[PDB]
Each structure stands twice: as C-alpha cells, then as structure tokens.
C-alpha cells in the first residue's frame, strides 16, 4: 500500500513508488567527523526567529508538524552556506522506540534518541510547492536530541500531543517560540541532500548542528504514545519514524568549525 515505516511499506520499499530513493544526493547520511572538511569561507548562520508565528500542530501519520505562518519574512534563516532568505514553514521530529536510536543522521555512526528538523524554503521561489522542485529550494536545520535533563522550551509541545494522538488530528498551537529548541552553539556541518521521507526530492541544503540539545526521558516517552493509524483503526504506536543512512556517493560534508 502507501509508504510508512513498517515491515512491508518501510524505507526499503520506497524506491518502488519513488525511484529517486536510489538517487545521487539522498539523505540522511553518516557524518564522519574526520573526513568532513573545514571550510573557512562558510559564514556563521543567521537565525531570526523573534517574529515567528506558530499556527497549528498536526499528526500527519508520519510524525507531528508544527506549522508557522510563512506569508511574510517573519522567521527566517540566512547566512551559512545559503544564498538568499529562507522562511520557516514547519518543524517536526524523528524518534525511536528506544533511547539508543531515533535520529536520521548519525555522527561517526553514533545514533541519537531523536532528530529535530526545522524546514525552510527559499523565498525567491514564491512558495513551498515551487521550492521543492529546485536544487536549492529548501534549507533544513537538523538538531540532535540526547536523553538527559529536560528541555523547558519543549514542554508546551509535549503537553498538547494528547490532543493529536491519531493521524489527521490537528490543534491550534499559537505563540510557540522555536528559539527555545536551539542549542547554545551554532557550529554546523553542511551538505547537499534530500527530503528524508517521500517524495524524497533532492532539493535540500542540510545544516546539521554539532551540539545536541537534552530532553528528559519523560518528554521523549510522550512522543512514543502517538499513533501512525487514524482514529478508530488498530493502534500502531508512532515510533522509529526514521530513515537509515544513505550512501554519500560523490558528495563532501563541510564543517563550519575546526
């Protein structure tokens, strides 16, 4: 049937419906810290989220998305390896059934408990739909989550998950500040890649932060209570919604730090 993260419709099956799954710039990838090249020409990232306007949180059957108003340059990302302004449209997470797995990207083969993806689109293309059809259409900021101390700024998200337990459910989610999810340092790695879930388009400039944020065992546990299924259908817990690392092929990972 349609794609998912199960035994019969998982990542290993995606190529049948989406041939690009075996493409030349697929994500995620393993970041080998010793092979990454320090690039002195990489500018610091510029994250301007002070005017961000969150609108809703939704369970789309693959994860839960926090959507923002992207009709104006309210929350933008620029600098780094980017040319132009990229507007934040939504953020979501990828997590595992156990604390030892869950992230999509890995660092020297190390897996994290979860991975946060803040998705931005290049304003020169007018809208998200047009942007995904361009090689420099999207900029995704990836942040690793490790289990340890609780992250205060994440609790607002955790507490509303009960309201969107099943696929298709959404809830008003206003005044959420994404700055509360950022680590102290903005040092990063960057490489050209793709969406990590269908349609797997190769339109993403990945920016993966080196510093993970810590979340409590209790906070991640609540993520694991969500359902892939819709209301009224057999319960399938939403866990392990991550794609395994793909071949780097002819690509180089650059680092903003040495």
Binding site for Zn ion (CB under 5 A): 117
Return d(Cα 105, Cα 165) in angstroms, integer: 26
Q: By C-beta, is 104 or 136 nearer to Zn ion?
A: 104
Q: Which two tokens stand for residue 81?
A: 């390896």
Identify which of residues 45 and 119 has a Cβ nearer to Zn ion in the complex.
Answer: 119
**Is 90 strand, coil or helix?**
strand
Cα angle vertex 247, ends 237, 144, to 5°?
Answer: 50
**Residue closer to Zn ion, measured from CB, 9 or 44:** 9
Minimum CB separation of residue 147 from Zn ion in Å reads 19
On whether the CB atoms of residues 177 and 153 are closer than 8 A, the answer is yes
Q: How many CB atoms lie within 10 A of CB 38?
A: 10
Supply the minimum distance, in Å, between the C-beta of residue 73 and Zn ion.
23
What is the nearest approach in angstroms of Zn ion to the Cβ of residue 90? 10
Q: Which residues contact 189 (CB under 8 A, 6 or more apart)?
A: 31, 36, 206, 207, 208, 210, 253, 254, 255, 256
Q: Judged by CB, which is closer to Zn ion: 124, or 224?
A: 224
CB of 241 to Zn ion, least distance (A): 9
CB of 40 to Zn ion, least distance (A): 30
Minimum CB separation of residue 67 from Zn ion in Å reads 14
SS3 content of the chain, % helix, strand, coil (to 5): 15, 30, 55
Could you tell me how far CA 176 lies from the centroid of its own chain?
17
Q: Is 8 exposed, middle or buried (0-12, 13-18, 19+ CB in 10 A)?
A: exposed
Residue nearest to Zn ion (CB): 117
Is the Cβ of residue 105 or residue 117 nearer to Zn ion in the bound state?
117
Distance from C-alpha of 205 to C-alpha of 139, rounded to nearest angstrom: 5
Residues 6+ apart with CB under 8 A from 72: none
Q: Which is nearer to Zn ion, 38 or 65 (CB)?
A: 65
């Amino acid at each position: 049937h349609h794609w998912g993260y199960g035994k019969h419709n998982g990542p290993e099956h995606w190529h049948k419906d989406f041939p690009i799954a075996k493409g030349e710039r697929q994500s995620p990838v393993d970041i080998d810290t010793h092979t990454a090249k320090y690039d002195p020409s990489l500018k610091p990232l510029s994250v301007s989220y002070d005017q961000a306007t969150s609108l809703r949180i939704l369970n789309n059957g693959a994860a839960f998305n926090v959507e923002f108003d992207d009709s104006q340059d309210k929350a933008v990302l620029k600098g780094g390896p980017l040319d132009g302004t990229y507007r934040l449209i939504q953020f979501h997470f990828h997590w595992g059934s156990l604390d030892g797995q869950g992230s999509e990207h890995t660092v020297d083969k190390k897996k994290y408990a979860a991975e946060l993806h803040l998705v931005h689109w290049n304003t020169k293309y007018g809208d998200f739909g047009k942007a995904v059809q361009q090689p420099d259409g999207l900029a995704v900021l990836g942040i690793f989550l490790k289990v340890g101390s609780a992250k205060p700024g994440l609790q607002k998200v955790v507490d509303v998950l009960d309201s969107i337990k099943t696929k298709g459910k959404s809830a008003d989610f206003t005044n959420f500040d994404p700055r509360g999810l950022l680590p102290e340092s903005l040092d990063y790695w960057t490489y050209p890649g793709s969406l990590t879930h269908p349609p797997l388009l190769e339109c993403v400039t990945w920016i993966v932060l080196k510093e993970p944020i810590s979340v409590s065992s209790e906070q991640v546990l609540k993520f694991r209570k969500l359902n892939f299924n819709g209301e009224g259908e057999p319960e399938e817990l939403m866990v392990d919604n991550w794609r395994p690392a793909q071949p780097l092929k002819n690509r180089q990972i650059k680092a903003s730090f040495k």
